[PDB]
Structure formats: C-alpha cells, structure tokens
Amino acid sequence: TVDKKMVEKCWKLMDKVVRLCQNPKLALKNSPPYILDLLPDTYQHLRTILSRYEGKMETLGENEYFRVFMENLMKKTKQTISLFKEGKERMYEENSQPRRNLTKLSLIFSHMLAELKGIFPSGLFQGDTFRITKADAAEFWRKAFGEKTIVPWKSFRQALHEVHPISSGLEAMALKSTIDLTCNDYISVFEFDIFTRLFQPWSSLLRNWNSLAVTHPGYMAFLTYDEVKARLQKFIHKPGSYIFRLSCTRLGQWAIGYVTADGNILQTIPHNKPLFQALIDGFREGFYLFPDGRNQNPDLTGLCEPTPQDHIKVTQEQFELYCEMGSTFQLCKICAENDKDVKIEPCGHLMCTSCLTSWQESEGQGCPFCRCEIKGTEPIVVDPF
C-alpha cells in the first residue's frame, strides 16, 4: 500500500543516490544509462502520477503495479546506497566489481523508468489496456492473465510452460534473467512485450531465444554503442567479425556491430524484422561471418522457413464506404499506387511496404496516420470484396 510518507521516503533515498553520483571523483560518463538523469526523471513522472490522482489516492494506493514498483524503487535505491558504503574507494576504480554493479543498477533504473512511462503514460494508469505488439503474444497474455499488468515469475513460468515448454531450471533461470528487466521477481506486460518483440515469431519463441541468446556467441545482451566498437577492435584484421546487442534507449529492439572490408566498425539496426532473418541475410553475402571473432558460426536455417502472410478480408460495410470515395479499402492511401501489404503494430494502420520503408528512412519509427511508435510490423494480404 502506497501512502504519502512512503513516496517521500523514496525521494529522500533517491536524493542521497544523486549526491553520491554527483562526486567528481567518480568521473562517470554522460552516456546512457546515466543515473544522474534517470533518478530526477523518475521523480517527475511519479509527481505527474500523483497530480493525476489528487483526491483519488485510494485507487492509486491499492494499485498492485504501483505498490510493486514503489517497493522495488526503495530497494534498488537503498542497494545503491549500500554499494557506495561497502568499498568506498572501489567506487573510483574504473572497472572494479562495485563499479560494474553501479552500471548494472543504472540499467535497472532505465528499464524501471521506461516501464513506469509505459504503464502510466501521462501519469494515468493504462496497464490494464496495455497494447502488446505481436498478436500471438497478446492472445497468450489475455488467455493466461487477462488484463493483469504484473504477475509473479512462478505464475508467468507455469503459463508459458503450457504453450512453450521449458527444458530445465537452468533454462528457466536464464529465461528469467533476460525477461525480468526490473529485477523484482515479477513479470510485467511491458517486460513481456519487450521479450516477445526481440524473440519473435511467437510460434518458436523459446527456440529463437535459445538459438539467439543462449547458444549464440554473438549475443552480448545490453551494451552501449562505444562498448561494441571497443570489443570489435580486437578483430580489425578479421573481415566478417560481428556482435549483436540490446539498447536501453531502444527497448524491444536489436542492434548489430560488424567489421567491413576496410574495418571502421559499423553498427546497424534491423528494425521490426526477426534477428535471425538479418543474421542469415548477413551470412549469405559475407557480412556477418564470425560471432565475437570465433571461426564457428551458428546455422539458423531451422528458424527461418517461408511462412504465409496473414490475410484480411474486406467487409460489405468497408466496400460500400470505399465505393463512395471512388477507391478501395485495400489500396494504400499514402501512394495510391499499391495495395496495403504491411500492418503497423500495435495501432493496426495499414499501408504498402514501399511507403513504410520511405517513412522509416526519413521520419523514423512513428505511424504516418496517428504518430504511434512502430513497435513492430507484420506483412499482410488484403483480400478484396
């Protein structure tokens, strides 16, 4: 239960962590995850929530997700406070174990902040109506948990095991490590969305996860842009050397770092396409050949098998309405040259892949019709009336 004093206590602890990090003796880099920016940003969003719930503090206080988040915020802030207390001088040692823990805790605050903004957009609770990107993933969460925002790990593990069986406790604990971003032993709808975006398609979820995050030597998990260039510097004279990682700023998305014919160390983003599709493409035309400089590259052919696109039938209501316009439902309304063959997830807006690519090339990952973030895409076919 979240009261007035509990929130005030959290902020006082948050302030102490800021004071400890403000020390010029640490000389920490401004690059994300930057805790000196993350904690003050967490204070403002919480303040935004409270102003949206002024008077309605009974509804906010008894809210399960908010209770859990606040409990985890105090715990993570106190953990950082103790980290500075135990081994004070080790905080200034560049690559020491306590310093690596501060970088790990900073990542957690970044995930925690993105989760809070995802569940409470504009300060109002939208967790019960959270839009899961992939359709098959959304149907799993609805049938197993309904409109629940957060569920305990053991409850998530038993539901998942029914659809995608888990081989061992070793696999379950590795699976827990990748999906539980906030490190609180609970799995949120936001965390689920991220895992199901990265390890798509849903139909072979654990196979994709095992082949890309467990058995793949190229998997580096969360890594900053600079660290990718720093790790690939060892393999400058080995053309085809590559690595793939996650970004705290671009949650749910992948990023590949490779060495060219000359070197230079280039970094690309596949954007809403399955990672193995880009890795297989990248291997057959000699770009991604050596994962983490190793001679042996994993064969991912078993994951990529030509599948049919989802079909959408236009109704009588839609046909009649489009006839008045002097057009069809299936025609792309941006170019008016092709039929709609791609669906933006989760808004559902349709256009041709051509208009999408051009929009993404210049404007970014935002829907042309409603400005909603392009969390994912799906190729589709619109069957005329």
Binding site: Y258, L266, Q267, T268, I269, P270, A278, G282, E285, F287
Partner: peptide
C-alpha cells in the same frame, strides 16, 4: 545519433 543502414 549516427548509426549505419543494413548491408
């Protein structure tokens, strides 16, 4: 931010 297109 300066990334790189897909090869």
């Amino acid at each position: 931010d300066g990334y790189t297109p897909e090869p």
